[PDB]
Design a protein around this nucleic acid. Structure first.
Ligand code: SF4
Length: 493
RNA sequence: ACUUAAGCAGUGGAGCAUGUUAUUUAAUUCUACCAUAUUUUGAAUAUUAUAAUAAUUAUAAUUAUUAUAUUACAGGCGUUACAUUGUUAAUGAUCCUUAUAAUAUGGGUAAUAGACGUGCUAUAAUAAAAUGAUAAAAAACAUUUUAAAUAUGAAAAAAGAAUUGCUAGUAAUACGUAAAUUAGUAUGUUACGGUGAAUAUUCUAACUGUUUCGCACUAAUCACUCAUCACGCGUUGAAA
RNA sequence: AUAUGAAUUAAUGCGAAGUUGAA
């Protein structure tokens, strides 16, 4: 626990090692797995892992009870850390006082997972009115969710579908903005819109995803459709955005403008040219409990599939929105803020409003050498930035930057604040796609003359009938002519 | 059909070794890190000048060299969320230039509540110790002694989860030899030979692919369909 | 009887996101 500076404290993110409640670990390893002989649980967990090892895949509901317990094993470990960190980010950014939500909803394939994390977070003295929690996967998951929640302090209401006769002030989503690899662009909009309807005034939505390029794509698309950066050009900073309804981003994003890292299609992470592309992931460390230690052992699961750790480094992407309060106050407040005080063109190097909301976020592990720390930042201006701190520019700023880590908000000035030039090829890619759209319309027009001259050549020497073109090849042209015709037909659809 | 049950061979609580994590720290780097002093064209190339040296022209002019200044800069174990080549360091781009460069001293990389992996040695008598034939790229044989926390071990005894392999020149060997990294270090890896067993498979079995049936499922059983509970809007039917 | 209106009243159609059963 370092002195650093008071501002550096608010800037820093929760870096402590993660741990499950010992009661919960004892409960799981005593009941949920002791009856099961470990081999079958390991087999079903391995099955679950193998079908996500595929590039840019998505997680799936747990079909059968053995897969149910295997999901309790493998993914509770990861999702608990993800939610715990994201909720800590939320609590700290909004302040510890504003976060006393009464109406609580959690959606995810796992057990009541946001519920347990929230309980552990704000402590065992917390007894709201409502603690609804839907479990998508299986009925057998709810009894084990009850088992887990019993050891903590039940009022949690285990459902199977979203109750839609009530609004909520706190909502958590885990792996819910998509369910199919295909249909990716649009299911995110449908799913998010489904939940934004049931977010009460002043509430918060906390979305957590896998943290691989597909997941980053999901968060980026959700942010784009919700904020709509293009609808408010030249508007820097964070003012709530429409979607009598208004929403703003709490974290990780430090700007409401477009995401600099967004490339539209996940599949292009799979190409040779996409071998250096980068995405807004976020790592954390959590120490393995007994069962994982007992579980992740054997040739099947504890070897190179072809030394051990006490902990897992989990990747996840996440997003948060804060909702404004329905009132004669907030609406006019937002309207006037958008009218009379634009926050100007925040320059590269700027710190935004110089409050925790608009601080640059450290989106890569800072690289540290003698005297100087360099940082890769998503800036409140919104461009990728390399900021270098030195012993020269100061001693204290160097001290703080030299303890800086990924996922922290850096909150000071630097001697150089240049653009993050490297792997900004997403901006080069934004050119390529727009090239295609304009030149796509040349493609059909080229294809017209390409096929016309081919057939005009055909008819000349087939009307003249010298038949220099072979019977095999001539009938090949006719195949191309009609085949090209049909392919144009369906492309209209 | 792994695996299990059996039989056999074992290993598994102790320590260290070797790492990792955490916590701690001014650092506990990823000599490269911390504290205190201390150097600013520095390491090179060029410019432009005053000093000597030469060569010329004519003391001066020029050219060099050599110093001293001279600033472009040099320098950077800075960057790959800095690229392209090259390979399995370079160019470029950018960043620092009383500092991110340079030197010195000391300190750290070895801190220790914990936690986990990898191996070696132990815990005695179908087995250790002392003494006396054979390889490829010494165990063996012989004799004797041998306590009961020792004369074992260089805490460790009793019981457990776990786990490794199962006819084979395989396992195991308190059997050794050798190579590379190396100025020096191996309990790590690699090969390389010598000796050469035990023991038998009722059983269970996920996963598992074929499959058979039905389907009203087609995002595929969390599938779809049906009924309930509420809100409004209609349509028609009787009517004192 | 052929119509036209009616307090009172029967059934059913639709749709909004859902709520409840497991036919
Ligand atoms: S790069 Fe910045 S804007 Fe994009 S998702 Fe990450 S934090 Fe948000």
């Amino acid at each position: 626990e370092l002195r650093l500076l008071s501002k550096t404290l608010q800037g820093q993110s929760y870096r402590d090692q993660l741990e499950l409640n010992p009661d919960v670990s004892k409960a799981i390893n005593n009941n949920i797995m002791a009856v099961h002989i470990p081999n079958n649980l390991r087999r079903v967990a391995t099955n679950y892992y193998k079908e996500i090892q595929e590039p840019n895949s998505l997680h799936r509901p747990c079909r059968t009870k053995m897969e149910v317990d295997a999901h309790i094993a493998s993914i509770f470990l990861q999702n608990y850390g993800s939610i715990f960190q994201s909720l800590k980010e939320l609590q700290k950014r909004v302040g510890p006082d504003n976060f006393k939500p009464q109406r609580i909803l959690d959606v995810g394939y796992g057990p009541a997972t946001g519920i347990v994390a929230l309980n552990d977070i704000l402590g065992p003295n917390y007894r709201p009115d409502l603690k609804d929690a839907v479990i998508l996967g299986n009925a057998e998951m709810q009894e084990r969710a009850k088992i887990i929640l019993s050891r903590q302090l039940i009022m949690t209401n285990l459902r199977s579908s979203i109750p839609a006769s009530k609004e909520y002030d706190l909502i958590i989503l885990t792996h819910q903005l998509l369910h199919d690899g295909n249909q990716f662009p649009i299911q995110v909009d449908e799913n998010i819109e489904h939940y934004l309807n049931i977010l009460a005034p002043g509430g918060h939505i906390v979305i957590i995803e896998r943290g691989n390029p597909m997941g980053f794509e999901i968060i980026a698309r959700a942010r784009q459709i919700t904020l709509r950066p293009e609808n408010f050009p030249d508007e820097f900073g964070k003012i709530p955005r429409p979607w009598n309804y208004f929403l703003k981003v709490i974290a990780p994003c430090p700007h409401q403008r477009k995401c600099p890292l967004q490339v539209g299609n996940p599949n292009f992470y799979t190409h040779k040219e996409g071998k250096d592309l980068k995405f807004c992931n976020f790592q954390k460390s959590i120490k393995r409990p007994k069962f994982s230690i007992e579980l992740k052992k054997g040739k099947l699961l504890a070897t190179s599939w072809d030394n051990g750790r006490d902990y897992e480094i989990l990747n996840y992407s996440y997003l948060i929105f804060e909702r404004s309060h329905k009132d004669e106050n907030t609406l006019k407040e937002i309207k006037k803020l958008r009218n009379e005080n634009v926050n100007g063109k925040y320059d590269i190097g700027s710190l935004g409003d110089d409050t925790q909301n608009s601080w640059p976020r450290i989106i890569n592990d800072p690289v540290k050498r003698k005297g100087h720390v360099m940082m890769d930042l998503c800036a409140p201006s919104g461009e990728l930035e390399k900021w270098t701190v030195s012993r020269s520019f100061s001693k204290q700023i160097y001290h703080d930057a030299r303890k800086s880590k990924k996922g922290d908000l850096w909150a000071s000035a630097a001697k150089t604040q240049i653009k993050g030039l490297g792997d900004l090829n997403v901006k080069k890619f934004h050119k390529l796609e727009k090239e295609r759209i304009k030149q796509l319309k040349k493609e059909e027009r080229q294809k017209a003359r390409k096929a016309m001259e081919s057939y005009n050549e055909l008819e000349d020497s087939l009307q003249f009938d010298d038949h220099q073109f072979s019977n095999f090849e001539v009938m090949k042209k006719l195949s191309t002519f009609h085949g090209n015709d049909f392919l144009q037909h369906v492309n209209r659809k």
